[PDB]
Design a protein around this nucleic acid. Sequence first.
DNA 1: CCGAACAAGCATCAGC
DNA 2: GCTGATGCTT
DNA 3: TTCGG
Length: 326
Amino acid sequence: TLNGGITDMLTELANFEKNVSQAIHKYNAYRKAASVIAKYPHKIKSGAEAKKLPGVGTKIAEKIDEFLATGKLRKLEKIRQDDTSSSINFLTRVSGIGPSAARKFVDEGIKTLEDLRKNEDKLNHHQRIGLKYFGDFEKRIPREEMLQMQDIVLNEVKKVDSEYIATVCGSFRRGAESSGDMDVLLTHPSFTSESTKQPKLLHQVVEQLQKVHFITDTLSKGETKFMGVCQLPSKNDEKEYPHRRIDIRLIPKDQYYCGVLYFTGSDIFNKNMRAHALEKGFTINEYTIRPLGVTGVAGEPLPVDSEKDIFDYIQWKYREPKDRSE
DNA sequence: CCGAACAAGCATCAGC
DNA sequence: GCTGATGCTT
DNA sequence: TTCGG
Ligand SMILES: Nc1nc2c(ncn2[C@H]2C[C@H](O)[C@@H](COP(=O)(O)OP(=O)(O)CP(=O)(O)O)O2)c(=O)[nH]1
Ligand SMILES: [Cl-]
Ligand SMILES: [Cl-]
Ligand SMILES: [Cl-]
Ligand SMILES: [Cl-]
Ligand SMILES: [Mg+2]
Ligand SMILES: [Mg+2]
Ligand code: NA
Ligand code: NA
Ligand code: NA
């Protein structure tokens, strides 16, 4: 964290633009700037120095000069004073409350945590569970707990069907010492891009994890993506572990490598790689890499037999998961 | 100058 | 009900 | 807000 003050400032600006201004491109620009500065291996001495990095333009360069001179950004100082901005920023911290609902809640006088708790019947299901576990979902998961969670998930999936493969992705697969949640990629030979030979493949796994009281709540659930809540079991007389967000993604087995690339991330790494794919004439999603035709319409999926194959297509040298934490 | 900026699953809603 | 747009999320 | 053509 050579430049943690700068990257925190840019992250706070990004969140302001997303949550309050609902300006998604500004949000992305600030986040890209913070990510490129975060990996820059020198302590930044001037905006001009920072402007040399891709993603830092004139306006962010100027803010970095103000920050280095004074330790503060007046723009941010005033955003923190604004009650409506501060209200909206808080409400979006609840899972399921985004920029639109936060502002809508604002027009109704429902601001504080106390307000939300009094008006549970104004919340959809996702928002209600996000409020229920508001405190817990702000805590990080130590890697040691991620390992215990991995063991439960993999073993419970094995008990349903030994042919399932469950892989923990996200920051865990990138080797992080702590994670914000648990991301589980799931495959089964019956589900490929060619056929679905078994129904309920994701459901059966969700059900088993509920039976053993690992999964405790559901935020959303369809045939290939589960979003919910889990909790490690605690010993006698021990305080309970925090409840944790879990995401499970069932991916066609023949498309595992595109799937595990997507689900390992980071999010900014994915955006950067997909942007580069487009410049190289390809489009990458969690399923396939496809060439872009002369008019820019995706062609047919290219053959992929490793994560590295995807990097090769777009002429990037391979990056291990630990080096994708952008 | 100015168009593009990653891609998509699930929940919800409007309109038919 | 279906379709398509939108919100929220990964 | 930034970049690329
Ligand atoms: N193309 C894209 N892909 C994405 C995007 N958002 C998330 N993802 C992908 C990449 C993430 O690693 C993966 C998990 O998403 P998660 O939010 O859990 O991110 P972690 O890397 O695990 C940080 P942690 O706080 O959870 O520890 O989902 C996206 O906008 N666009
Ligand atoms: Cl914008
Ligand atoms: Cl500040
Ligand atoms: Cl693949
Ligand atoms: Cl596809
Ligand atoms: Mg995660
Ligand atoms: Mg571009
Ligand atoms: Na730059
Ligand atoms: Na939120
Ligand atoms: Na996640």
